[PDB]
Nucleic acid binder design. Structure first.
Lengths: 753, 133, 755
RNA sequence: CAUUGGUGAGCAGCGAAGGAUUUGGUGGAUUGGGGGAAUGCCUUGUUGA
């Protein structure tokens, strides 16, 4: 559908809040985590992105559960059975109700619905790969129990199925369809259930902070534990001998707990956002002092009990809130710089690892409204310049050490910092204040250097040409400024029709683009201080735009949900993409390959692939709502007989000259009468105004090879009539040589003189 | 034997074997070119050029006779062409140890090039241009 | 100049190890270097794909069945995908282990990699756009073996994989879970180590070769099973069979040796067709064309860096050199030929616009230090560490003279006048400078003026001034052609090694003893000193060159970097070499103003000013449509089509707006062109001329333009110098064609009158 | 006389209920020459079974 960009991948995604699940690959483990309509598979020990799924679902992922290689995901009424991120099978419930949870034991598939109905699937053979055969359908009447909480299976219960309600526990015999057990009515609503490493115990977390160690054989309590004001979300068992228990709250606070000395030991504090719902799932691995934590805050953290409190071991995460401003950091498309509204600062990689690093800020800092970056002096001092909302000083940052700068930048007019900019050489800091002052700092020694003041409203954008000679600016008062940077001289300015909201400069073509309030993109030459173009068409506010690296294209995006591309030499909008969610920012990579978009909903950063293989297009708008080879080849340092006789009948030597010009250097073929028709062929060769450079070579080679039979010992046979036919037209072609003597000698004279 | 290995801060044990093979080639060249009639200008001219190029290589820094070719060409002579021994005897560092300690970590310069090898060799005419960085 | 300068060639072909193969077309040679992949076309060698994600310098390479997919594998086990013009389509870390061989199908469905103790086969992706995080899909994998897999062979059914192993045995693999003949039966009995196996293209002869020269023949009888048919025992050949490849003609064998010779055989005859020697250096690998007409074989890195192309009727198609690390470069006065100087003591000429290895000269006793042309185009002077210098003319191939005469073992810098009268050389170890008349080798004088080693020397185009930079913080100026001598200045700073002259006699560029590179005129007004030479993976100043238009200089030290500068202060662009373990040692500037050179230890040149970039010179878009307004000015007003479509710069327009205007209109156009739109069209004709066959057409253009504005380019020099050189090479290379053959029809008519 | 080196007590200013210096383990990403034989050996001839 699109004619430039193609939807490639999203980066920066770790979790979303759906419960992750643990899988076994031989002796090691992997983690299955959800993002949206796409899931990710990580290492359990060293945390590498091992798989991303190949194809998005129609709807959001609800339940995730896995076996030895088989990742099972849920949506509307379809169970997706995948291996290595690739679908083996799609197995659908025979209904339209939404699937809630999954439990996979033995050879069956247990599918919960939202209408309190459960479907049961089977294999054929006990050595088959997955269940696909229908077995039966059970229901949960509300007179037997309320809404289904979750599905589990306790081991050595042959064909029994554990279905817990919000009030009581229903134990089934699925081969027969019976209800073999029902538990009595409990006081509090249950939200959490979890198996045990011993028989017949199932754990129950209530809506309040009560832990119930329930027995399945007798049906009675063994132990309950009250925690004041805690909503239990997750249970699991550290079965490394150290018989413990963790209890999750909705607050993001996590209770690591001792079960036999009966000890409250630890609590993790806003490791996951209470705003995003707190700790969504916490699980011990089997047999190692390891617990894994994930919440709704887009981060997994490994906490391990170093043999006693646990410890932050290693983790991966990202911006919990969607981003505000990004930038490309390298000329090799590797690291991107990203800032969001939840006040963190992350530098991501782009490559196959999807390792990334949060920056070092050393209660968070205020969010960034204006960013600028140079990669000319990396490693030596700071080269990233950031503003903040409602502040008066712009901080600096190192790209090398991933650590914050050492300089604060003053407006010296008591305004807010509205725009930042750097030169190409990386020596200078340009800062424009909301009261209209443009001040200029050193980037090396952090000192005040120079001050300009011409605008009388908020200076909304500063840039500088790559030669560091001419300094451009823009105000809200419709004024565009043009300065010498070498002097403080006041070269020239322009009056326009509207306030200017954004400015992005292109350095290797010396142009710049301005977004006005009349919803039009103006393109202005930088050299001659002249407006050259004005482009109309966006029905709403222009948000972000960027030049393509070769300077031919401009891609903008707006609140009409359009992303348009604009060819500068033709003045015409060449393609729009009409999307379903409006992206906050867009930037080209410095290489001509990648287009970066940042959106309002969801945290990831979508990446688009520039095609760049071909096109010859200019189509339009509104739609849906060699010459050395022969001449060196002749000097030798170390049938066809139908056509020439059919040319003995008429003038058919064009096909013959075509088989001369086609291939096969024919120095042996012209030596295997006929010579007269050969010369008449050649006079038809000179008759057209083409290919004389091969023809002269044919003529001269003819006088190299057959030059005695041409001579006939004592000439003037009918041969010489054909030579006479060649002579006069060869006198016609004599003209070209003297022109070559003219240009060679005159060019030699202007070379000398 | 290992007296030489310990006197001149040799980083290896192989280097005594290598310089032993080179000096063996020089001695057998000397013996084979020696056993000629002594008025044959082949012998005089080639032993003469061998003398002059062994002047330039700094091994025979001593101005020599013919019979020195059997006598003085040892391993320790070419080992005294190694860089830090030139450095010490040019009175820059204080011991050979500390000279090797300086060349291990980059402060020494022959000509316009940085050196970090303790087995670079100097001529009798390149050692004028040794300084620091 | 602002253009995107990037690598799209390299300086000479094979320095490093790898596999080698042709295309299916028979006209495209696939011969890698270690660092990148250089795929030539056989007629008029050019350069097509230039990957660089290789962190390690070895390749394994093959294309599928039409050349739409290329891979390349290094030691680590990551690969990189390109389609036709180096898109770098896909990228894929594939293995933590190394690969031995890669093989496609003739069908493009399956994919073959040998690694470790396993055998991987992959489902091949088609050409598309991107949008796969992991494009490769696993089809099957086969377990197992006893040790490493070293060679691989595919069959025509695309069902039948014949693979050897390192444990002196061979195995067979059915692709589609067929169990073809229900057997994956091993092959044993081999006394010696296995170097390869082949499956014949008639499904009845299964072929194995061992390292000793032995060849074993099995049949398709599966009494019932495998029986041997023809054995051998070689004990007196006494080498090792290094590489082996088999013909698609299915009659012939090719065997490569460590001894340095090339064997040919027949398959069931075992006749000796031919063997050929090329040296003692071992043959690394050999591959045949798909029709048996052309042979090509690669030679190992420590041995020959040479790859020959021998046919079955025994004549060498392409011979070549391309030796090691390089000392010096210089461009010829025609912008097509580039000299190189190698360490082993040769001097080779490279036609790097077309990839030929043209000609050599070998009189050096040791390494070569300096090469430079004279401006006549006749002669070039070489300087050595031989203790002498010598002269050369091009296709007479004959040594004029070898100037020397004082006892000396080292020269280091060689420079001549434009006048061709006198040649000066600077001794690295004498504190004096030498001159020679080229008439005799008489010694005129010995100009005693320095106190340190003299280390860089150059002349002027004014040609009365000698620039003499010695390595004692002292720059000197000399008079040679007057009746006196001169006073010579003092630097402020920092011992110099690199001197570079403006072609005016008015500016001198020096490199100080740090990253500061500095310039001053001939009245010692120091204009700029400029900042350091970055990019460690200490800082230096080795070479520097003044560009020909007089607006730029190029700096190259030994620190993986090369910098651009203008006459004012600013750093323009820094290009650089990425690889892993000096690099740069010499840089000079082309007389075509399209690119320049940088002598690296890898060996890599081009910069290539292109025209794909939108420049807007003189308010391009007030001429709103590049199409319809130009369409109006193809019907009317041909003066205004030039100025309109010339401010525009789509190269896909200039062919038609330049072609379409009539012949009689041309002197009226050239008489009325503006003087500001002149050089870009004079440079456009000088590089458009060499391509097409419109000789009459462009020639009446250059008659009109050179007839039009002769005095204006006479006074406004140094850009039409570059353009004028570009047109003069076209004039001479067409003149020497048509004068030759027009003479060869000028003798004929009077030869008829003879008898 | 040289706010000259070492050392200690105060003041202006900068900040507020903590500051300055120093170090260990841990996790993520990057990184042989000259002479000679008995004796023994090697090669070759021989002598008897």
């Amino acid at each position: 559908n699109s004619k430039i960009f193609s939807p490639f991948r999203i980066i920066g995604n770790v979790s979303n809040g759906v419960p992750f699940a643990t899988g076994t690959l031989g002796s090691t483990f992997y983690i299955v985590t959800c993002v949206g309509k796409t899931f990710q598979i990580y290492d359990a020990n060293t945390l590498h992105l091992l798989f991303v799924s190949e194809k998005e679902t129609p709807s959001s992922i609800v339940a995730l559960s896995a076996h030895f290689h088989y990742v099972y995901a849920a949506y509307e009424n379809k169970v997706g059975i995948y291996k290595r991120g690739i679908e083996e099978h799609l197995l659908e419930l025979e209904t339209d109700a939404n699937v809630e949870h999954l439990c996979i034991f033995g050879d069956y598939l247990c599918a919960s619905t939202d209408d309190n109905s459960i479907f049961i699937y089977k294999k054929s053979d006990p050595q088959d790969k997955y269940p696909s055969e229908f077995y039966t359908k059970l229901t949960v009447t509300e007179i037997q129990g309320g809404e289904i909480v979750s599905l589990q299976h306790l081991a050595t219960y042959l064909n029994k199925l554990t279905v817990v309600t919000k009030s009581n526990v229903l134990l089934f015999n699925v081969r027969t369809g019976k209800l073999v057990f029902t538990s009595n009515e409990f006081p509090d609503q249950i939200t959490t259930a979890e198996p045990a490493p011993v028989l017949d115990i199932i754990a129950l977390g209530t809506v309040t902070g009560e832990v119930i160690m329930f027995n399945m054989r007798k049906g009675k309590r063994i132990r309950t534990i009250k925690i004041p004001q805690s909503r239990i979300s997750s249970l699991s068992f550290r079965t490394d001998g150290s018989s413990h228990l963790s209890v999750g709250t909705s607050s993001g606070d996590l209770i690591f707990y001792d079960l036999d000395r009966r000890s409250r030991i630890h609590v993790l504090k806003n490791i996951h956002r209470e705003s995003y719902g707190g700790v969504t799932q916490a699980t011990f691995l089997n047999g190692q002092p390891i617990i894994v934590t994930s919440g709704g805050d887009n981060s997994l953290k490994e906490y391990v009990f170093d043999p006693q409190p646990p410890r932050y071991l290693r983790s991966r995460g990202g911006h919990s809130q969607p981003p505000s401003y990004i930038a490309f950091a390298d000329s090799q498309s590797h690291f991107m710089l990203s800032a969001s509204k939840d006040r963190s600062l992350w530098s991501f990689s782009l490559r196959k690892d999807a390792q990334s690093q949060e920056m070092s800020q050393r209660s968070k800092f205020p969010e960034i409204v204006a960013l600028a970056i140079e990669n000319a002096r990396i490693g030596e001092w700071e080269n990233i310049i950031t503003a903040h909302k409602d502040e008066k000083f712009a901080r600096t940052w190192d790209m090398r050490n991933k650590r914050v700068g050492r300089w604060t930048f003053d407006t010296t007019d008591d305004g807010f910092v509205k725009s930042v900019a750097m030169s190409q050489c990386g020596n200078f800091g340009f800062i424009g204040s909301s009261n209209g002052s443009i001040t200029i700092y050193n980037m090396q020694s952090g000192i005040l250097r120079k001050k300009y003041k011409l605008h009388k409203r908020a200076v909304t954008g500063i840039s500088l040409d790559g030669m560091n000679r001419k300094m451009v600016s823009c105000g809200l008062d419709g004024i565009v400024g043009f300065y010498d940077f070498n002097k403080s001289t006041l070269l020239g300015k322009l009056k326009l029709d509207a306030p200017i909201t954004a400015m992005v400069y292109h350095r290797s073509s010396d142009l710049f683009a301005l977004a006005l309030d009349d919803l039009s993109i103006v393109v202005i030459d930088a050299v001659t201080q002249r407006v050259v173009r004005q482009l109309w068409g966006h029905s709403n506010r222009i948000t972000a735009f960027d030049f393509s690296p070769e300077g031919r294209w401009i891609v903008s995006a707006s609140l009409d949900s359009t992303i348009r591309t604009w060819d500068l030499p033709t003045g015409g909008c060449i393609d729009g993409i009409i999307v379903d969610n409006v992206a906050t920012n867009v930037k080209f990579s410095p290489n001509g390959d990648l287009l970066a978009t940042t959106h309002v909903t969801g945290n990831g950063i979508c990446i688009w692939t520039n095609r760049a293989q071909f096109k010859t297009v200019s189509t339009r708008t509104i739609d849906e709502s060699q010459k050395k080879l022969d001449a060196e080849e002749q000097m030798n340092k170390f049938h066809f007989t139908k056509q020439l006789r059919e040319g003995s009948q008429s003038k058919d030597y064009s096909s013959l000259l075509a088989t001369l010009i086609n291939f096969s250097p024919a120095a042996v073929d012209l030596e295997i009468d006929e010579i007269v028709w050969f010369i008449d062929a050649l006079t038809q060769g000179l008759k057209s105004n083409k290919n004389f450079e091969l023809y002269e070579t044919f003529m001269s080679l003819l006088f190299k090879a057959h030059g005695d039979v041409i001579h006939a010992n004592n000439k003037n046979q009918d041969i010489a009539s054909a030579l006479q036919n060649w002579e006069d037209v060869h006198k016609k072609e004599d003209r070209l040589d003297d022109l070559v003597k003219f240009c060679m000698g005159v060019a030699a004279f202007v070379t000398t003189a | 034997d290992t007296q030489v290995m310990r006197t001149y801060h040799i980083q290896n044990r192989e280097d005594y074997h290598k310089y032993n093979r080179i000096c063996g080639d020089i001695r057998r060249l000397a013996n084979k070119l020696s056993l000629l009639p002594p008025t044959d200008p082949f012998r005089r001219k080639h032993e003469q050029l061998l003398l002059d190029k062994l002047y330039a290589m700094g091994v025979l820094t001593t101005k020599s006779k013919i019979s020195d070719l059997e006598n003085k060409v040892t391993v320790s002579a070419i080992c005294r062409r190694r860089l830090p021994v030139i450095m010490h005897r040019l009175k820059m560092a204080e011991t050979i140890q500390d000279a090797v300690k300086f060349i291990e970590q980059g402060h020494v310069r022959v000509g316009p090039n940085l050196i970090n090898d303790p087995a670079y060799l100097v001529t009798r005419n390149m050692e004028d241009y040794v300084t620091w960085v | 100049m602002k253009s995107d300068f990037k690598f799209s060639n390299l300086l000479g072909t094979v320095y490093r190890q790898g596999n080698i193969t042709f295309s299916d077309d028979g006209k495209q040679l696939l011969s890698p270097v270690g660092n990148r992949v250089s795929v030539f076309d056989l007629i008029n060698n050019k350069s097509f794909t230039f990957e660089y994600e290789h962190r390690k310098n070895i390749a394994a390479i093959d294309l599928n069945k039409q050349g739409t997919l290329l891979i390349s594998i290094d030691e680590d086990g990551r690969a990189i995908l390109v389609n036709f013009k180096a898109r770098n389509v896909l990228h894929h870390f594939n293995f933590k282990e190394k690969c031995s061989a890669v093989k496609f199908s003739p069908d493009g469905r399956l994919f073959a990699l040998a690694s470790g103790r396993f055998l991987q086969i992959w489902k091949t992706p088609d050409v598309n756009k991107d949008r796969q995080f992991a494009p490769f899909v696993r089809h099957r994998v086969h377990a197992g073996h006893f040790q490493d897999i070293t060679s691989l062979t595919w069959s025509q059914d695309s069902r039948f994989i014949l693979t050897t192993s390192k444990d002196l045995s061979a195995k067979i693999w059915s692709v589609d879970s067929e169990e073809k003949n229900l057997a994956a039966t091993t092959f044993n009995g081999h006394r010696d180590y296995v170097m390869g196996a082949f499956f014949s293209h008639d499904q009845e002869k299964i072929y194995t070769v061992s390292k000793d020269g032995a060849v074993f023949v099995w049949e398709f009888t599966k009494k019932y099973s495998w029986r041997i048919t023809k054995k051998h025992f070689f004990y007196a050949n006494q080498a090792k069979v290094k590489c082996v490849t088999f013909h698609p003609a299915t009659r012939l064998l090719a065997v490569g040796f460590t001894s340095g010779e090339f064997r040919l055989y027949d398959l069931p005859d075992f006749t000796l067709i031919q063997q050929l020697s090329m040296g003692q250096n071992p043959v690394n690998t050999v591959s045949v064309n798909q029709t048996g007409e052309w042979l090509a074989f690669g030679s190992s890195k420590l041995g020959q860096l040479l790859v020959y192309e021998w046919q079955s009727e025994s004549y060498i198609l392409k011979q070549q050199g391309h030796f090691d690390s390089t000392n010096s470069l210089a461009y010829s006065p025609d912008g097509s030929r580039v000299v190189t100087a190698s360490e082993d003591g040769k001097i080779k000429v490279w036609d790097i616009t077309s990839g030929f290895c043209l000609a050599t000269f070998e009189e050096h006793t040791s390494s070569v230090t300096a090469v430079q042309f004279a401006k006549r185009g006749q002669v070039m002077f070489s300087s050595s560490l031989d203790g002498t210098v010598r002269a050369w003319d091009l296709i007479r191939y004959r040594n004029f003279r070898t100037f020397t005469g004082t006892e000396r073992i080292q020269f280091n810098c060689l420079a001549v006048d434009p006048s061709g009268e006198v040649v000066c050389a600077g001794s690295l170890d004498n504190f004096d400078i030498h001159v020679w008349s080229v008439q005799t080798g008489q010694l005129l004088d010995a100009l005693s003026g320095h106190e340190g080693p003299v280390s860089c020397l150059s002349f002027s185009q004014e040609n009365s001034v000698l620039a003499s930079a010695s390595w004692d913080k002292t720059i000197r100026i000399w008079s040679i052609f007057g009746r006196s001598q001169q006073v010579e200045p003092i630097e402020v700073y920092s011992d110099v090694l690199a001197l570079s002259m403006r072609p005016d006699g008015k500016e001198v560029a020096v490199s100080t003893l740090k990253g500061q590179i500095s310039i001053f005129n001939i009245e010692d007004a120091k204009q700029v000193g400029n900042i350091d030479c970055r990019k460690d993976i200490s800082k230096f100043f080795t070479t520097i060159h003044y560009s020909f238009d007089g607006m730029a200089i190029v700096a190259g030290g030994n620190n993986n970097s090369i910098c651009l500068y203008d006459v004012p202060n600013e750093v323009l662009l820094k290009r650089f070499i990425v690889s892993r373990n000096v690099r740069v040692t010499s840089v000079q500037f082309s007389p075509t103003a399209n690119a320049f050179a940088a002598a690296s230890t890898e060996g890599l040149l081009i910069y290539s000013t292109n025209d794909t970039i939108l420049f807007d010179p003189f308010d391009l878009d007030v001429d709103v449509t590049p199409h319809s307004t130009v369409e109006a000015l193809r019907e009317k007003q041909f003066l205004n089509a030039l100025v309109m479509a010339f401010r525009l710069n789509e190269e896909y327009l200039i062919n038609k707006v330049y072609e379409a205007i009539p012949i009689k209109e041309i002197p009226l156009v050239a008489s009325n062109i503006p003087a500001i739109y002149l050089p870009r069209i004079l440079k456009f004709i000088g590089d458009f001329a060499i391509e097409s066959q419109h000789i009459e057409f462009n020639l009446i253009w250059i008659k009109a333009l050179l007839s039009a504005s002769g005095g204006y380019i006479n006074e406004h020099k140094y850009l039409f110098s570059t353009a004028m050189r570009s047109i003069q090479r076209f004039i001479v290379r067409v003149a020497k064609e048509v004068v030759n053959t027009t003479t060869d029809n000028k003798y004929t008519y009077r030869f008829l009158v003879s008898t």
